[PDB]
Amino acid sequence: MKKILIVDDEKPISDIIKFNLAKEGYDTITAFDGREALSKYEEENPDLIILDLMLPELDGLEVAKEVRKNSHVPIIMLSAKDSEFDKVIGLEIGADDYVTKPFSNRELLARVKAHLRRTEN
Amino acid sequence: MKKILIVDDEKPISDIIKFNLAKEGYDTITAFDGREALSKYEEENPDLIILDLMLPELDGLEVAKEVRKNSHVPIIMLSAKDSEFDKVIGLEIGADDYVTKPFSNRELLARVKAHLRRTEN
């Protein structure tokens, strides 16, 4: 199975993503801070990271940069900041996608599927 | 350089995307209906397709379906339909991204870069 790393500080959001991804047959691991995200990414090799922008310790931009030091694993950024600026900055840093909260669970699921399917190709 | 196929029946929209992509160093080719899109996609081999959903002759889902028979070339779908349903359908058929109209040009550009950058990896 494909393993999704879900990093978000707010546990109710993380549980909804985890539950929906589990329904679809994904393995899921969670991190609730930027530092925890980076250690979980190195130790467990997720196939995709869902990455909140506002995290403890290290924010999502910083996490994304460290990941991109070493890998091309797809990154879908989540953000309450729905500015045009923030979306461009996330993508240029190395996000493969940028989704604002509130978001649709099905849309995120299909975005997860779409980016995992590219990795195959 | 990279070649972007821009398929939108509405020439003002197409011109703004052509202009912004050309400014960023991209080569650009255009189509204005689904049939013309498929012939240009076949004969000119774009590195990325920006694909309007509301097309005459055949709509963007059909274009995407046809293209996907033979290539994994990235497709960024554009749509005035801002519904969760239409976003998921486009992604499931094989769109790599789905962006609603009206859109930010820097954001679309950033998404163009992000999906071309994935192909290079």
Numbering used by the authors:
A (entry chain A), B (entry chain B): 1 to 121
Text taken from the publication that reported this structure:
VicR is a response regulator, which plays an important role in S. mutans growth and biofilm formation. Along with its cognate histidine kinase VicK, it constitutes the VicRK TCS that is involved in regulation of cell wall metabolism, nutrient uptake, osmotic protection, and biofilm formation. VicR possesses two domains, an N-terminal signal receiver domain and a C-terminal DNA binding domain. A typical TCS consists of a sensor histidine kinase and a response regulator, where the histidine kinase senses an environmental signal and relays the signal to a cognate response regulator, which in turn modulates expression of a cascade of effector genes.
To determine to which domain the 2-AI binds, recombinant N-terminal VicR (VicR-N) and C-terminal VicR (VicR-C) were generated and examined in the pulldown assay with the biotinylated 2-AI. Western blotting revealed that VicR-N and not VicR-C was captured by the biotinylated 2-AI (lanes 4 and 8), suggesting that the N terminus binds to this reverse amide 2-AI. To define the binding of VicR-N to 2B5, we attempted to solve the crystal structure of VicR-N in the presence of 2B5. We obtained diffractable crystals and determined the crystal structure of VicR-N using molecular replacement. VicR-N forms a dimer in the asymmetric unit. We also identified an unmodelled density surrounded by four negatively charged amino acids (Asp8, Asp9, Asp52, and Glu10) within the experimental structural map. To further investigate the binding, we docked 2B5 to VicR-N using AUTODOCK 4 and determined a binding energy of −4.98 kcal/mol. In the docking model, 2B5 is close to Asp9 (2.5 Å), Asp52 (2.6 Å), and Glu 10 (2.9 Å) of VicR-N, three of the negatively charged amino acids surrounding the undefined density shown in the experimental structure map. Further, we have demonstrated that the lead reverse amide 2-AI binds to the N-terminal signal receiver domain of VicR. This binding may inhibit the formation of the active VicR homodimer, which occurs at the N-terminal domain.
